[PDB]
Design a protein around this motif. Sequence first.
Motif, short mmCIF file in Angstrom:
data_model
loop_
_atom_site.label_atom_id
_atom_site.label_comp_id
_atom_site.label_asym_id
_atom_site.label_seq_id
_atom_site.Cartn_x
_atom_site.Cartn_y
_atom_site.Cartn_z
N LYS A 127 0.84 -1.20 0.00
CA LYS A 127 0.00 0.00 0.00
C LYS A 127 0.88 1.25 0.00
O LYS A 127 2.02 1.20 0.48
N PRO A 128 0.36 2.37 -0.53
CA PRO A 128 1.21 3.56 -0.62
C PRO A 128 1.73 4.02 0.73
O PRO A 128 1.01 3.97 1.74
N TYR B 119 7.03 9.01 -2.11
CA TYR B 119 5.85 8.31 -1.62
C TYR B 119 5.33 7.42 -2.73
O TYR B 119 5.58 7.67 -3.91
N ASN C 57 3.62 3.20 -3.87
CA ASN C 57 3.54 1.76 -3.66
C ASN C 57 4.94 1.18 -3.70
O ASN C 57 5.85 1.80 -4.25
N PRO D 41 -2.64 2.98 -11.65
CA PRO D 41 -2.81 3.86 -10.50
C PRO D 41 -1.85 3.50 -9.37
O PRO D 41 -1.67 4.31 -8.46
N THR D 42 -1.25 2.31 -9.43
CA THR D 42 -0.20 1.94 -8.49
C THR D 42 1.15 2.35 -9.05
O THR D 42 1.46 2.03 -10.20
N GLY D 43 1.94 3.05 -8.24
CA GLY D 43 3.27 3.52 -8.65
C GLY D 43 4.06 4.19 -7.56
O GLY D 43 3.71 4.12 -6.38
N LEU E 184 -10.18 3.95 -5.74
CA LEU E 184 -9.55 4.07 -7.06
C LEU E 184 -9.02 2.72 -7.55
O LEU E 184 -9.27 2.33 -8.69
N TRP F 256 -10.23 0.53 -10.74
CA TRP F 256 -9.28 0.09 -11.77
C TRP F 256 -9.03 -1.43 -11.76
O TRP F 256 -8.84 -2.02 -12.82
N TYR G 205 -8.25 6.17 -2.03
CA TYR G 205 -7.29 5.50 -2.91
C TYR G 205 -7.60 4.01 -3.11
O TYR G 205 -7.37 3.48 -4.19
#
Lengths: 424, 137, 140, 67, 103
Positions: free
Chosen positions: A37-38, A111, A113, A94-96, E20, E24, E17
């Motif tokens: 998780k971020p 900040y 993932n 959207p994950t990065g 989101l 997705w 989030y």
Amino acid sequence: QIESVTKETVHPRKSYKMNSSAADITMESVHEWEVSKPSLLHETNDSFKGLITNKMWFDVQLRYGDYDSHDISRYVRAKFLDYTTDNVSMYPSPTGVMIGIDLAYNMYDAYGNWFNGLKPLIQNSMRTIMKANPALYVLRERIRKGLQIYQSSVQEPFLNSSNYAELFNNDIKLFVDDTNVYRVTVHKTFEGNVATKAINGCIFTLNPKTGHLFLKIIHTSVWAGQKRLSQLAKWKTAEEVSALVRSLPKEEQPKQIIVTRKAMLDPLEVHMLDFPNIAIRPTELRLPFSAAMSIDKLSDVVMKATEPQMVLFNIYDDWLDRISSYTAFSRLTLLLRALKTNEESAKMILLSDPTITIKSYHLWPSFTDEQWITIESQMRDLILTEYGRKYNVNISALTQTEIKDIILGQNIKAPSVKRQKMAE
Amino acid sequence: NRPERIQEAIAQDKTISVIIDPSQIGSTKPLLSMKCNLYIHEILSRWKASLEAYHPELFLDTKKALFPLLLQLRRNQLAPDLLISLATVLYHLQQPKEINLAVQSYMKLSIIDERTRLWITSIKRLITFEEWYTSNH
Amino acid sequence: GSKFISSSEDKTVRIWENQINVPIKQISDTAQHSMPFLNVHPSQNYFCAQSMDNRIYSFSLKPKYKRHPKKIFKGHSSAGYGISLRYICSGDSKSRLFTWDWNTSRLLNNINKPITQVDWHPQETSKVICSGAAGKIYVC
Amino acid sequence: KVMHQIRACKDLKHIIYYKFNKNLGKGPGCGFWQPAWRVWLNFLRGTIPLLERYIGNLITRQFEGRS
Amino acid sequence: DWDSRKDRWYGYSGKEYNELISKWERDKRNKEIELMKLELYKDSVGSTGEGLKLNELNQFARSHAKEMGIRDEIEDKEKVQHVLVANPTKYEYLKKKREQEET
RNA sequence: GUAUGUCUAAAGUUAUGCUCUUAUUUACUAACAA
Ligand SMILES: O=P(O)(O)O[C@H]1[C@H](OP(=O)(O)O)[C@@H](OP(=O)(O)O)[C@H](OP(=O)(O)O)[C@@H](OP(=O)(O)O)[C@H]1OP(=O)(O)O
């Protein structure tokens, strides 16, 4: 376990565009990654949920803080979950990951993932880059200059008359002079005052080992675009040099680039940011390469030039064939030196004998080694004569000192000279 | 299918004059392309012999950089402005007494630009090796 | 063969080297120039040229940087041309030709019949061609 | 002179928030845009004449030459 | 602590989030012939240094200088022999022929 | 370095004592170098 590290080419705007962000690097994976998780970098307990990613992205987010916005972590987090969760400038996942650098405070943070066992690499990476990125170092140095607090501390010493030997050492190099980039015809006007007009010039781009003098002949067309041309000369120079370097391969990309004009180093540093491995060498010893362009055939070629073109030459050909490069270079140095003192004298020396003939390819007249020696001696006398005339103390010279005088590089105030002298 | 693409091509690969006419650049196209394309293949083969003498690491990727040209040349995807500059480099590279003219022609070729740099730079290594190859021989 | 000169409508003359494309010398401003012709000067220092303002000039072309005129050839109402061999002979717009002592700038004024493009038969010592408008070429 | 309006708005915010955040803690989540909105309306009322004159003259100059 | 108070996002779990990712992750669930060969027929089918020798010659410059004209002579030797050491190309031969005699 | 000001930017309007060679000064100018 990364399949491909591709750079998503964005506009130049992205660098500084703040309302949106396209991802700079896109990260195609081999297998599905199961990113955490971020979270921030130093936030150690990264939670690995069941969500997976086949593809990550890396974004940089440069910022310039104030006395009030001088925390970065919060800002970077905001940036991350702003651009993700915003319907403009979507990332492929959207994950990065998102890095942000406070340039005003040297406060890196990032900040996003986290792929398993990735975080340490990123932390270490950031630590390294901050310690010494070229661009960032330039920036700090620029700011430092802006505040007139520049601590004159260099890691590598300058090319003084002692280190001249260790110029070259089975090591691919290049050598640069920007002196005859902006030459001018001074002509009268109707008003009566002077009007300066640009002439074609050059980018003296020499290699002491091979003797391969590159020189991109500056067509006056490139000045016709803009004004404030003395600075622009430097910029075009460094630009051209940079381009040349880019063109050559990683092996033939020259390591230590030497520059005649120490003022022209400043923009070169900037255009050398394309590739960090190419070290810069500010020469303490001034070498005569203004007079280099007053060699007959060179000047001829310069005049001839009709467009943005380069016409390389071997500054010494026969000499290479006879002897090692250094020997050739000494002769060349003498010649250029003499030219710098006086062109007429130089030409006279060269064309003292009219029977000798300059070869079609060669820039210089092909002499036999004893007559060559004589010529060299004569040239040296010319230099000494000049010194006597101007400096008025060319008689009582010490050996090292004399050598320095020949170059005209080892300055009296230069502490390197004090060092060498001290040693002996 | 693929077998007749092996047969026709490898037969055609051993069927060419490794020559560049300096006057046929003015003419309009696959003749100069395939002349150069298979002249490069000879520059490849002369490398392949003395790979132990020369440093082989950079060549392994030079191969991958050359692969675009091969795809450009046999198709004629390569532009006239590029091709005229390109063939000019390869022609001067044939004569041992055009080493000035070789890198001369290469510099005027170099002077969108992402893999184009990569392969054009790879061509300089072909001159760099060939220039050395004729010296140490 | 090397140095090369070309005046212009803006009243400026330009000494160049054959191929260098860089002005060795732009000439002074307040004069005017139209026809450039080198006198067959024994030393070959001299580049002569006709003006708009009725006055043919002379220039020390060796060195090219030299350009101080010694004595100016006044009295030929100019819209035309002029040529040298001792003497310089140039024609005028209105009436007729004008021979001039190159040393002192004064001699006979021969009738033309208008136009004016003078020249000398160089293989001989004394023979001129005038170029009148509309098939009136006069020879001497 | 819009500083007055701005100042008024600031004052309102200061007033509002501290009647809006008695027992409630700090933070950004207060709405209540009425009185500030009123301020801006009155500013527009004030300026509508001014802009009718100003932009009037402007476009007149664009069309008719200046006097 | 300004930027903490400004912090548009502050004091939250990624509830927005995760929504989101949920939006997705649903989108995840919802979703040459000869020329290749023509090029690959050729092999690929994967798919200090010399300045020390100067530094020795410059050390040999110390030899001829240490023989004749070190300090006693102002111009007659220490400047004249200075002109005749290190600067000219002939000094390569002066050492080279001493090497050739040494061989 | 500028304000500013000119310039160019393509289509054919129907008439029959001197010349010379040089070296030196001084001045002014010069977004050219120091
Ligand atoms: O007094 P101002 O200069 O207009 O600034 C105020 C003030 O901040 P400071 O006290 O730091 O100056 C408020 O803080 P409090 O006095 O209420 O503690 C804060 O209100 P909130 O606490 O309700 O956020 C508000 O911030 P905001 O505009 O986000 O409501 C902020 O205004 P500025 O952010 O424009 O400085």
